[PDB]
Amino acid sequence: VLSEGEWQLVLHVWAKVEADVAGHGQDILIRLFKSHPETLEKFDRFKHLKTEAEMKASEDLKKHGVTVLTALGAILKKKGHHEAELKPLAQSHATKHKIPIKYLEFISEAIIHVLHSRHPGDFGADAQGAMNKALELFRKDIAAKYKELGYQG
Numbered sequence: 001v002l003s004e005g006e007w008q009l010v011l012h013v014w015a016k017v018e019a020d021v022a023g024h025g026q027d028i029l030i031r032l033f034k035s036h037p038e039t040l041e042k043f044d045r046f047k048h049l050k051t052e053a054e055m056k057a058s059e060d061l062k063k064h065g066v067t068v069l070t071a072l073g074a075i076l077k078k079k080g081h082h083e084a085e086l087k088p089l090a091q092s093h094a095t096k097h098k099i100p101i102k103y104l105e106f107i108s109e110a111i112i113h114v115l116h117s118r119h120p121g122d123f124g125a126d127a128q129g130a131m132n133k134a135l136e137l138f139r140k141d142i143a144a145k146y147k148e149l150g151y152q153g
């Protein structure tokens with residue numbers, strides 16, 4: 001569990017991801033798609049995209065970024081108590097989208113990368129540590145639901 005000090009670091013930095021949701025969203029997913037191209041095979045809708053310029057041009061992608069970041073944000077603000085917001089996500093990514101838990105590790109990487117890219121200033125080592133910790137907690141609790149369902153962590 002994170003301390004109050006550590007949640008304050010995470011949300012104090014999210015309050016500025018929240019400043020431009022759509023720019024952040026778009027950087028994160030392009031980062032994911034280029035570092036692990038096998039993830040793009042999960043969206044039939046983004047399979048046509050083949051270059052980064054195509055990715056940056058897609059209004060559909062940008063729209064999926066806002067979705068991902070709005071869901072994430074809602075979980076983060078619930079701090080240590082986020083089971084209401086977490087469960088539907090894990091059932092759908094587990095059972096609908098067939099997303100392995102390894103990809104959520106990939107996208108947390110993506111997320112920390114971009115935050116450091118856009119905020120070499122609120123995202124020092126202490127804030128990097130908090131954020132790591134919040135994302136592992138996210139992954140841990142997801143993997144627990146996956147386990148239950150037979151997809152397990």
Ligand code: HEM
Pocket residue numbers: 039042043044045064067068069071072088089092093096097099103104107
């Ligand atoms: C930070 C982690 C993630 C968040 C917060 C997130 C959240 C969401 C949300 C809210 C939706 C729409 C409603 C629902 O189906 O739950 C969604 C759909 C989807 N997600 Fe995620 N997601 C995450 C990670 C990913 C990853 C890593 C994959 C793929 C490698 C993935 C693949 C998809 C696909 C296939 C859809 C269905 C809609 C579409 O075709 O884009 N998601 N996700």
